[PDB]
Design goal:
Chain lengths: ~100, ~280, ~10
């Protein structure tokens, strides 16, 4: 029962462009055990129709998952990934930055 | 190029009531093509790639039957490991198994592997000669003794060297339009001020397959790792992958630095410079 | 094509 905390990357499927439809990804990895809650946020609010990949893991046995949904970047809408896991004191929020 | 076929199984026990949660996924190179989830409705091996849909009902009946046998094995393992380690029926525990075969450019056997983990640490693995076992602790040494007496490694070697490789060729041929194509990274370079004295250069690699890639920064033709950040390769979600590498430099000295990109899909490494 | 046959206990 060693406990490993998740790395998080938030990013778009295609280069972002205000007003053009896209996919928002939250890729979580390097964590253990597998139970984990991932949400995609819009202005702090919970996007409902979010899908995710079948659990898998790396050579060091730590897990990874992709969560994703459809979205449209805009000038004023704020997007983030909110992740909670047993090894985390508080649910970590990671903002979408279109340069990353 | 070289190719591999690999299978990943995860079983997570549920205290209080019922069976463990079990998930299985299968890969050719970096393409998922099959899955099973004990919580989904079908209770069958399901396809995840078009070139595997063409296989007939006999295949899907066999795969489903075998994957449910795998799930029942992990159900028993979790029970027995709890016994070996003298743990309570109250906690939640994980078993993970992974195995597969690599072929070379000639598509002949290069290597096979089979490893097992409990609670996220090495438990028992098959050695590279496919003839004996690596046991991490005394619980696993007891398993090593069960398996040498039942000649599991011999049984396992037939599969890896034989059956595993045969079907890998078959998959490579039917998915050849996808599995045998390389997609070269689309690369560009962006620029972000980080103060009045500093600037970030971010070198991007998009839409590439397979996922192995190398991005490196140079300054005046010499390697540079100070003040560089390199993110883990990540999936785009459409089957391809992404990566970027960044360097912080002094404003006005952007031209001294070059980004270099190596990938199977590129006949030569690419070179990138910043341009105003 | 996953392994076929009696996958033994631990």
């Amino acid at each position: 029962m060693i406990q490993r905390t998740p790395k998080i990357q938030v990013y778009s499927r295609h280069p972002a462009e205000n007003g053009k439809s896209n996919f928002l990804n939250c890729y979580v990895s390097g964590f253990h055990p597998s139970d984990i809650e991932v949400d995609l946020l819009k202005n702090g609010e919970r996007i409902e129709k979010v899908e995710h990949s079948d659990l898998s893991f790396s050579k060091d046995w730590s897990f990874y998952l992709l969560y994703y949904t459809e979205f449209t970047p805009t000038e004023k809408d704020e997007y983030a990934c909110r992740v909670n896991h047993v090894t985390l004191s508080q649910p970590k929020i990671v903002k979408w930055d279109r340069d990353m | 190029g070289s190719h591999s076929m690999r299978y990943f199984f995860t079983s997570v026990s549920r205290p209080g009531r019922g069976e463990p949660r079990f998930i299985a996924v299968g890969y050719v190179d970096d393409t998922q093509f099959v899955r099973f989830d004990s919580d989904a409705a079908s209770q069958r091996m399901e396809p995840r790639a078009p070139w595997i849909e063409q296989e007939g009902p006999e295949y899907w009946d066999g795969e489903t039957r075998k994957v449910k046998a795998h799930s029942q094995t992990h159900r028993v393992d979790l029970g027995t490991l709890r016994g070996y380690y003298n743990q309570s029926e109250a906690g939640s525990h994980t078993v993970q198994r992974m195995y597969g075969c690599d072929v070379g450019s000639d598509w002949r056997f290069l290597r096979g592997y089979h490893q097992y983990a409990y609670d996220g640490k090495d438990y028992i693995a098959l050695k590279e000669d496919l003839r004996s076992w690596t046991a991490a602790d005394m619980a696993a040494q007891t398993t090593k003794h069960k398996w040498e007496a039942a000649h599991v490694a011999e049984q396992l070697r037939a599969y890896l060297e034989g059956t595993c490789v045969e079907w890998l060729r078959r998959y490579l041929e039917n998915g050849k339009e996808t599995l045998q194509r390389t997609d070269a990274p689309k690369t560009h370079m962006t620029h972000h001020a980080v103060s009045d004295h500093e600037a970030t250069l971010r070198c991007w690699a998009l839409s590439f397959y397979p996922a192995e890639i190398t991005l490196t920064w140079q300054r005046d033709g010499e390697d540079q790792t100070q003040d560089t950040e390199l993110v883990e390769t990540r999936p785009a979600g459409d089957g391809t992958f992404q990566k970027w590498a960044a360097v912080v430099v002094p404003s006005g000295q952007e031209q001294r630095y070059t980004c270099h990109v190596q990938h199977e899909g590129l006949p030569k490494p690419l070179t990138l410079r910043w341009e105003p | 094509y996953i392994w076929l046959g009696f996958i033994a206990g631990l």
